[PDB]
Amino acid sequence: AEPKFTSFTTADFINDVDMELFIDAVEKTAPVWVKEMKSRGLLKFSMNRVWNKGEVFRVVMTYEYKDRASFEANIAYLEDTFGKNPVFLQLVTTAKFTTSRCLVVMEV
């Protein structure tokens, strides 16, 4: 009946200082936003530092949801908490973010 959903968000930063501020902020606050996202059916999150694209400061973040309802619930949470929050938005003002939303086709 129910496909799984996974999102890949690539965050690109001007320099190391900016990326390190983001990473530290994400890690430090995880105890709150992870609890909330898991209560809504996030299965797993990961942050991944890109190493094969030269001198860039780039992470890929992965969000693995149980199903559509979890995906939708977690989008609403992230909008409310971060996307619509001008103080957070200012924290990453010169960063570029781009997300690919996916249906899981095959996993082994």
- Beta bridge partners of residue 41, listed in sequence order: none
Q: Which two tokens stand for residue 70?
A: 């979890």
The amino acid present at 62, given as its one-letter code, is T
Q: Which tokens in the block code for residue 45?
A: 């999150």
Please give the backbone phi and psi of residue 69, each rounded to the nearest 5 degrees, phi first: -65, -35
What 3-state DSSP class applies to 55? Answer: coil
User: Which one of ligand OHA, a second copy, none interacts with residue 107, CB within 5 to 8 A by kind?
Assistant: a second copy
Closest approach of a second copy to the CB of residue 90, in Å: 22
What character string, x for contact with ligand OHA (CB under 6 A) and - otherwise, covers 17-56?
--------xx--x---x-----------------------
Residue 53 touching a second copy (CB under 8 A): yes
Q: Which two structure tokens, joined as six digits, stand for 83?
A: 């996307």
Residues near ligand OHA (CB under 6 A): 7, 9, 25-26, 29, 33, 63, 74-75, 78, 82, 88, 91, 97, 99, 101
